[PDB]
Amino acid sequence: RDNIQGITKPAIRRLARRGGVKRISGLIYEEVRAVLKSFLESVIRDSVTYTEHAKRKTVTSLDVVYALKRQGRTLYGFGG
Amino acid sequence: DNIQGITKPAIRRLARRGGVKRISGLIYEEVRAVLKSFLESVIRDSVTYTEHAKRKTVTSLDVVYALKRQGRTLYGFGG
Amino acid sequence: RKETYSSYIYKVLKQTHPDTGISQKSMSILNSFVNDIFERIATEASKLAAYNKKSTISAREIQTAVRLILPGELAKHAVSEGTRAVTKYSSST
Amino acid sequence: ARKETYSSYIYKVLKQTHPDTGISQKSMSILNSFVNDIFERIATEASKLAAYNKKSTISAREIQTAVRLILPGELAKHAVSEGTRAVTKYSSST
Amino acid sequence: YTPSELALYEIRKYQRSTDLLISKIPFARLVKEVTDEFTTKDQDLRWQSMAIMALQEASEAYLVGLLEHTNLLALHAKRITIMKKDMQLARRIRGQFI
Amino acid sequence: PSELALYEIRKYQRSTDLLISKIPFARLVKEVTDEFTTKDQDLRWQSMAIMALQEASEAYLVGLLEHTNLLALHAKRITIMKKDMQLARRIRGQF
Amino acid sequence: EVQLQQSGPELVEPGTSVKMPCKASGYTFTSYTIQWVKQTPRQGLEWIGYIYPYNAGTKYNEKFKGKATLTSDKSSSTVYMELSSLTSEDSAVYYCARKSSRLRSTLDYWGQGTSVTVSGSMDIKMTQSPSSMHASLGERVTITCKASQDIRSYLSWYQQKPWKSPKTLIYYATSLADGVPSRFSGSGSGQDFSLTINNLESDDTATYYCLQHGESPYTFGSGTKLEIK
Amino acid sequence: EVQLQQSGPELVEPGTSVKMPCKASGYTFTSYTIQWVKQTPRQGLEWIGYIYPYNAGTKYNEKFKGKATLTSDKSSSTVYMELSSLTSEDSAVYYCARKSSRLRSTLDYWGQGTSVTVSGSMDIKMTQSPSSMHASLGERVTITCKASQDIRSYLSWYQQKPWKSPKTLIYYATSLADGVPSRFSGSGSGQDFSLTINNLESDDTATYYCLQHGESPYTFGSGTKLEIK
Amino acid sequence: SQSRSAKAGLTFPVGRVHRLLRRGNYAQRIGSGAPVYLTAVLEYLAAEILELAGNAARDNKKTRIIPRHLQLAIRNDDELNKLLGNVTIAQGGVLPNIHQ
Amino acid sequence: ASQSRSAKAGLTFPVGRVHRLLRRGNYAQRIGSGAPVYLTAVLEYLAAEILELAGNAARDNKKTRIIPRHLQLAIRNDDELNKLLGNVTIAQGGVLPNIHQ
DNA sequence: TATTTCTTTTTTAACTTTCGGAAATCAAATACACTAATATTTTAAATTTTATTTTTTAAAAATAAACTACTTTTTATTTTTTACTTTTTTTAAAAATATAATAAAATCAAATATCA
DNA sequence: TGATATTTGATTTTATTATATTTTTAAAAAAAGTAAAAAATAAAAAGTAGTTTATTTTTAAAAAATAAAATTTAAAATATTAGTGTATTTGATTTCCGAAAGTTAAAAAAGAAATA
């Protein structure tokens, strides 16, 4: 259906199992979806600004790293 | 002691400004420890800045720069 | 001599509220604000230029820096206010 | 030299501590990013230190004081010891 | 085994692994949907594969950290069920609304 | 009692004064400075530097206590306890 | 994009309370205030008040102090408006409109509006001189909005078609709104402001309003009907 | 300005377990490991193990596994070592010493020590060449500690006066420990290292140990007791 | 000799911003029209902050702007709290808030 | 003969390239001759420390290759290295095996 | 305590040309993200029971707050000595700049081993 | 056992090093004026101590809410080839801005100044 629904409930259960969670309320899944959407919106806005400044029509892996570094979340392993 | 100079009423006043309705008894020593650790970090950076400039006095600008180094920017004293 | 924005902040205020005043400490606060925002935008513009193998800061670097630093409608109004100034100055010069 | 990396020197440094141990491509990319990140951190702090004191030169002392601010605890002590020893060897040759 | 035992086994299993837990194709579709609302005037933006991979790595790291803090808040109130009310509180004590 | 606490909360949020005394804080800052430099070099402290450091310290303490109070209400309490402050510090992530 | 979804028409007896939902989608709820406006034939457009969902802070037009009450629910991105003790004149159409917190901003997007049907000297007087005018299919038009006291540039221009929610044309007295044809142009500052339609069209038939937001109660214009032959 | 306070001497019969603390003050408690060392006259100094307060991670010597257990309490800033199933040979002096997590740093501060009395092939063996030597004042003295296997530069020199805690002289085989007169010098790499005392003094009478921390079990030297006549 | 700021229609100085950009180690060459843009943006931000602070000062029957008015103006609206999220304003107090 | 500056100071990392990156990086008008050598020594020390910790981590798994998991284990298991890299994500690093009742 | 007018009075900013350099600009060869089809399987969704946990109520316990009355500090006023920051001059020392000639480090495949 | 992924040796474009020279900073040395500290002293608020009350946190149990398991269809992600049309990147040329002295004129920060 919707693209947010593509983040299936088993995936969120796996993500919580990595975080050390034993039990999960039923209302968590929509909240996790909202949190992911907000994070993606911020980072993608910054990344698209970086891409459009360079007069490019593709978003390279360096724009994402620069956007994440702006938001204060440095990411090693993809350049920069 | 100099840490005991930060008295119980002062901590209660700070808590009221935070909106706290009633304070446990073990909070006061924990607040003293938290304040002391904050001071150690900020004063370490400030003293490093002061000694770089070959000065014997800590100016109002050294504290501001030490604060800004840690993402705790302060307006009203320069910079 | 200590350079400050105080002389300009006084005249900018007089346009909005011709009677209110600014105390010394609140003017120090506003001066620090202006310096801080200048530093932020200039640093982001320099990073933008360095990222793109360019050796000059232009109005486009500053525009993109404003769009990255300022949030939302606040950024939208600063772009239009800054574009009006570059246009009028260019025509006069 | 179209693309410049530190990978040639990280191999040499690793081939001293662990002659047998190798390193993957992703790990080398991570270490390249780490070295670039720390370089830009210390250089930025040194530039600010020179700006605050109305000096136009980044000397060895600006770099020392920048290392002391960025690196925490016992990293700063050993890093200052390592840097001070390299400048002494460089100057003794010249 | 028992439901309590299986959760511990799953926790240990998913802490050892380093691979990505969200599927690739749905996340790519979500990224393209989100980017369509920033470039919708007349320009369509493409996405490199490595760009989406970096974005997904960063997103999953952020989500795992947030869920760890949510679990801490759940343990604070003497519960083991993480609820909606302590994800919102973790989201706000950290401050960063990303 | 239950009413007076609200009055103090209302009064101390209106003011902008420094809630910690000045001389004890100056003594504490001069004591802490020794652990970093007291060997042969004793540093001196400008008055305005002390004022700036006090303002920063009190702002940090007030914010941490607000987050602690938010934590106490999460566990359905009115008393803020030590575990609340420790958890708030841990979740904030910076010291 | 941004839409302020609004409920359907409601009929009710006097002495009663009614709630209207104004759902907001396509933007961040807390960044913008929600403004409520009522439209009648007798009084034109009146501004009721606003709520700021970020801190839940409200401001009320003194004529509606008590009759209108705003609450906001951050969970469902909706703002509710309560009219109490309904009276014969409380019958009108009620729009919810989005305004940013920035001072230069105007009421950007409006809601469809609910039709509710029942069965203060220091205001800024907004004098719209041409009450109506007939024009052909491509000459130019000028509409004047004078203000009693000085409002610097916080004046925006609105076009409202028959049986439709208004549309923003100008804001800050010179700036062009988004997605607005370049022929529309506004000017003026201080006391006297003007709007101009350069190339008249078939789709330019509507009532044109001037709105000021420099002072505490926002006072709309008086209206201007323009028929094109 | 760091002190690792340790409890007083305690005498136990065989079979009753003992708990000894390491109260640490003057430093950030979580950033440094706490190392535990046993000293006897039959074998000399031996390394039991360490605890890392930051993650409560432990590592033990092969001999002492099952005979020692390390715990930490961050709230009280205390590290305990507990011995179980005691024997008359457990009678010794147990020092608690701090070592930073840095690979290069050594056991830089030692506790006062607590004295209790009860009433490996692949480990590198470090060999000190002079077991004892006499030297007048102002003469050069050299001590050699060879290594069974290769250690790059991880070797430190310790001076222990009679019935006192050891003092750190040189770490990383060349670097002078903080607060140590420049008369002391270190040299060597690989398997051959040396300690040199340039100008002897009245109080330079003590035993001098070489300690290597290159491999998993840390092994002290045999000992070399300088004497001055 | 018309000044650059008056030529652009601003109050804040364009020449001083050009001098601060060149001597600040930002780029090798600072193309013109960048001081104009930055000066316009700086003037806009300062004017917005000042106008909100003055509006807060008038509502308190005060004829002067004190740090508390500035703190109120910044914390009372979004997009200015976000811009100044990490900033402590001296003598500014805290925002009045109580919990249930 | 010509001796490289890194060989002159006894380093593996490049002193000349660090000098060049400082000159074109817009940090200061002038760059002293001692700054590249200091910075190169610090960078080499930090890289060697992390590499050797990661190698020790790799050995304990009976592994010869270093993968990002070993770097993540090396940094997160250390306190000062964790403070230095407090807000840093490492691709494919996972999370520490941390469970608490 | 701010807010002025005046007066300085150095100190910047504005103007003018002369050139060196960087940025805009087509054009071309190419790398590559995006579709379509397929299919084999891995994963996810849905119903239903049950088994674990969270919420509510009632008593018991721990513990903070509120007076009340005294001490212990702080705070404000002068004040003197003492160290420390700031300003000028110069002169020794160090970095910028240019130009060949050198020495190193990306690239491209190969050779066998390596690891997981 | 298997075979994608890492370790290696030779070509070659490209920095790195070296050598004179000129400028320029930054490190002494002598004043000269702030500005922090350490005493002395009473007003004057602020903190400490103690007991009792009155408020809340904690505990144990029973009713309730709800999430994890177990199957069992059903939907969809992986992987692999196929074409295609787009957009990225690299090289040569006119255009065009920005730098670099030298200079002249504004303009902005300090100061005793009047009134506010």
- Dihedral sign of CA atoms G25, G27, G28, G29 in order: negative
CA–C1' F42–L114 (A): 47
**Amino acid symbol at A65:** V
Backbone angles phi, psi at G173, to 5 degrees: 70, -10
The CA–CA distances, whole Å, from G110 to G44, G107, G156 equal 16, 7, 14
Residue D76 CA to residue J98 CA, distance in Å, equals 29
Start-to-end C-alpha separation, chain F: 35
Type and span of the H or E element at H117: strand H114-118
Measured between beta carbons, the chain B residues lying within 8 angstroms of C32 are: 75-79
Residue I22 CB: number of other CB atoms within 10 A? Answer: 14
CA–C1' E83–L65 (A): 14
Q: Which long-range contacts (CB under 8 A, 24 or more apart) does H5-12 make?
A: H5/H111, H5/H112, H6/H95, H6/H96, H6/H111, H6/H112, H6/H113, H6/H114, H7/H114, H8/H114, H9/H114, H9/H115, H9/H116, H10/H114, H10/H116, H11/H116, H11/H117, H11/H118, H11/H119, H12/H86, H12/H116, H12/H118, H12/H119
Residue C88 CB: number of other CB atoms within 10 A? Answer: 16
Select from D61, D62, D69 the Cβ nearest to the Cβ of B69: D69
User: Residue G121 has which token pair?
Assistant: 């000297």
Best of G50, G99, G102, G215 to disrupt the I interface by mutation (most I CBs within 10 Å)?
G102
Helix pair angle (F47-74, F82-92), 10° resolution: 110
Residue G225 CA to residue G219 CA, distance in Å, equals 19
Cβ–Cβ < 8 Å for J101, J79: no
Tell me whether I46 touches chain B (CB under 8 Å): no
Tell me whether G198 touches chain C (CB under 8 Å): no
Angle at A78 between CA J17 and CA D7, to 5 degrees: 35
**Amino acid symbol at H99:** K
Helix (H, G, I), strand (E, B) or coil at D65: helix
Cβ–Cβ < 8 Å for H180, H172: no
H27 Cβ contact partners less than 8 Å away, ≥ 6 residues apart: H2, H98
User: Residue G37 has which token pair?
Assistant: 């406006």
Q: Left, alpha or beta for C72 (phi > 0: left; psi -120 to 50: alpha)?
A: left
Measure CA to C1' and name the residue nearest L87: A57
Residue carrying structure tokens 């300005």: H1
Type and span of the H or E element at G49: strand G44-52
Type and span of the H or E element at H210: strand H207-212
- Dihedral sign of CA atoms B71, C71, A78, A19 in order: positive
Cβ–Cβ < 8 Å for J55, J66: yes
**Amino acid symbol at A44:** I
Measure CA to C1' and name the residue nearest K14: I1
Residue G19 CA to residue D31 CA, distance in Å, equals 61
Shortest Cα–Cα distance, C40 to chain G (Å) = 21
Mapped to the 3 state alphabet, what secondary structure does chain F carry?
A: CHHHHHHHHHHHHHCCCCCCCHHHHHHHHHHHHHCCCCCCCCCEECHHHHHHHHHHHHHHHHHHHHHHHHHHHHCCCCEECHHHHHHHHHHHCCC
Residue D8 CA to residue G41 CA, distance in Å, equals 81
CA–C1' E78–L59 (A): 14
- Residue H224: alpha-carbon gap to chain centroid: 14
Cβ–Cβ < 8 Å for G196, G139: no
Chain L positions within 7 A of any protein Cβ atom are: 5-8, 13-18, 24-27, 35-37, 46-48, 54-58, 66-69, 76-78, 86-90, 97-99, 105-110
Nearest to E98 by CA among A36, I21, A63, J62: A36
**β-bridge mates for residue G97, sequence order:** G35, G110
**Contact call for C and I: 3+ CB–CB distances under 8 Å:** yes
Residue B13 CA to residue G185 CA, distance in Å, equals 58
Domain boundaries, given as residue ranges, for chain C: 1-93
Helix (H, G, I), strand (E, B) or coil at B41: helix
Q: What CATH number has the domain spanning C1-93? A: 1.10.20.10
Kindly state the greatest CA–CA separation across chain I. 64
Cβ–Cβ < 8 Å for D48, D70: no
User: Residue G8 has which token pair?
Assistant: 């359907």
The CA–CA distances, whole Å, from J7 to D14, D87, F63, J41 equal 18, 12, 52, 12
Domain boundaries, given as residue ranges, for chain B: 1-78
Domain A1-79, CATH number (from 1.10.20.10, 1.25.40.10, 3.20.20.80, 1.10.10.10): 1.10.20.10
Type and span of the H or E element at H215: none
Cβ–Cβ < 8 Å for G224, G143: yes
The CA–CA distances, whole Å, from G18 to G12, G61, H179 equal 8, 19, 82
Measured between beta carbons, the chain F residues lying within 8 angstroms of E85 are: 74
Nearest to H220 by CA among H166, H177, H179, H181: H166
Domain boundaries, given as residue ranges, for chain E: 3-97
Type and span of the H or E element at H225: strand H225-227
Residue G114 CA to residue G92 CA, distance in Å, equals 8
Residue J101 CA to residue J98 CA, distance in Å, equals 10
How many helices, marked H, and strands, marked E, lie in chain C?
4, 2
Start-to-end C-alpha separation, chain B: 34
Query: Given an 8 Å threshold on Cβ–Cβ distance, is C64 in contact with A70?
Result: no
Q: Domain D1-94, what fold?
A: Histone, subunit A (1.10.20)
Select from H55, H57, H101 the Cβ nearest to the Cβ of J80: H101
Backbone angles phi, psi at B44, to 5 degrees: -60, -50
Nearest CA in chain B to D63: B52
Burial tier of F21 (Cβ tally within 10 Å: 0-12, 13-18, 19+): middle
Burial tier of H23 (Cβ tally within 10 Å: 0-12, 13-18, 19+): middle
- The C-alpha torsion from B74 through B79 and C4 to C7, rounded to 10°, is -10
| Domain membership of residue H37 as a residue range | 3-118
Nearest to G170 by CA among G158, G162, G160: G158
Residue H99 CA to residue H105 CA, distance in Å, equals 7
CA–C1' G49–K64 (A): 45
C15 Cβ contact partners less than 8 Å away, ≥ 6 residues apart: I11, I47
Residue G38 CA to residue G45 CA, distance in Å, equals 6
Cβ–Cβ < 8 Å for D26, J60: no
- The C-alpha torsion from E66 through E68 and E73 to E75, rounded to 10°, is 160
User: Residue G31 has which token pair?
Assistant: 């960044």
> Which letter does DSSP use for residue A4 in this model?
G
The length of chain C, given as a count of residues: 93
**Amino acid symbol at C46:** S
Angle at B11 between CA B8 and CA B12, to 5 degrees: 85
CA–C1' E24–L78 (A): 10
Q: Which residues of I touch D (CB under 8 A)?
A: 24-25
Residue H113 CA to residue H45 CA, distance in Å, equals 13
Measured between beta carbons, the chain D residues lying within 8 angstroms of I23 are: none
Helix pair angle (C59-69, C73-92), 10° resolution: 160
DSSP G61-91: -GGGBTTEEEEEETTTTEEEEEE-S--GGG-
| Domain membership of residue J72 as a residue range | 1-101
Helix pair angle (J34-60, D25-52), 10° resolution: 150
Cβ–Cβ < 8 Å for J94, E65: no
Cβ–Cβ < 8 Å for B21, F9: yes
Residue G171 CA to residue G156 CA, distance in Å, equals 4
Tell me the technique behind this structure. cryo-EM
The CA–CA distances, whole Å, from G63 to B68, D59, F56, I73 equal 49, 70, 46, 27
**Amino acid symbol at I84:** L
C 62-81: CB under 8 A from A: 64, 67-68
Best of J70, J72, J82, J89 to disrupt the A interface by mutation (most A CBs within 10 Å)?
J89
Measured between beta carbons, the chain J residues lying within 8 angstroms of H57 are: 77
Query: Given an 8 Å threshold on Cβ–Cβ distance, is C73 in contact with G175?
Result: no
User: Strand D22-23 vs strand J88-90: parallel, antiparallel, or unpaired?
Assistant: unpaired
Query: Given an 8 Å threshold on Cβ–Cβ distance, is C51 in contact with A50?
Result: yes
**β-bridge mates for residue G141, sequence order:** G197
Select from A20, A73, A77 the Cβ nearest to the Cβ of J68: A77
> Which letter does DSSP use for residue G30 in this model?
G
**Amino acid symbol at A62:** L
> Which letter does DSSP use for residue H65 in this model?
B
Residue G94 CA to residue E12 CA, distance in Å, equals 58
Instruction: Enumerate the H helices of D1-94 as residue ranges.
Output: 7-17, 25-52, 60-70, 74-93
User: Strand G10-12 vs strand A58-59: parallel, antiparallel, or unpaired?
Assistant: unpaired
Cβ–Cβ < 8 Å for G205, G111: no
The CA–CA distances, whole Å, from G2 to E37, G7, G97, G111, G161 equal 11, 16, 11, 10, 20
CB pairs under 8 A between A and J: 24
Helix (H, G, I), strand (E, B) or coil at I47: helix
Measured between beta carbons, the chain D residues lying within 8 angstroms of H101 are: 74
Chain K positions within 7 A of any protein Cβ atom are: 1-4, 11-15, 21-24, 32-34, 43-45, 51-55, 63-67, 73-75, 83-85, 94-96, 102-107, 114-116
DSSP chain E: --HHHHHHHHHHHHHH--S--S-HHHHHHHHHHHHHTTS-SS---EE-HHHHHHHHHHHHHHHHHHHHHHHHHHHHTT-SEE-HHHHHHHHHHS----
User: Residue B28 has which token pair?
Assistant: 């006061």
- Peptide-bond breaks in chain A following residues (C–N over 2.5 A): none
Measured between beta carbons, the chain C residues lying within 8 angstroms of A66 are: 51
Select from F67, F70, F87 the Cβ nearest to the Cβ of E72: F87
Type and span of the H or E element at B43: helix B27-52
Q: Which nucleotide is nearest to B58 (CA to C1')?
A: L36
User: Strand H44-52 vs strand H32-40: parallel, antiparallel, or unpaired?
Assistant: antiparallel
Nearest CA in chain A to E98: A39
> Which letter does DSSP use for residue G185 in this model?
E
CA–C1' G194–K56 (A): 67
User: Strand G68-73 vs strand G78-83: parallel, antiparallel, or unpaired?
Assistant: antiparallel
Residue I56 CB: number of other CB atoms within 10 A? Answer: 20
- Peptide-bond breaks in chain I following residues (C–N over 2.5 A): none
CATH superfamily ID and name for B1-78: Histone, subunit A (1.10.20.10)
Query: Given an 8 Å threshold on Cβ–Cβ distance, is C73 in contact with G100?
Result: yes
User: Strand H18-25 vs strand H78-83: parallel, antiparallel, or unpaired?
Assistant: antiparallel
User: Residue G103 has which token pair?
Assistant: 């001072």
Residue B76 CA to residue C31 CA, distance in Å, equals 8
User: Residue H139 has which token pair?
Assistant: 């003469």
Helix (H, G, I), strand (E, B) or coil at G16: coil
Q: What is the resolution of this structure in A?
A: 3.1
J60 Cβ contact partners less than 8 Å away, ≥ 6 residues apart: none
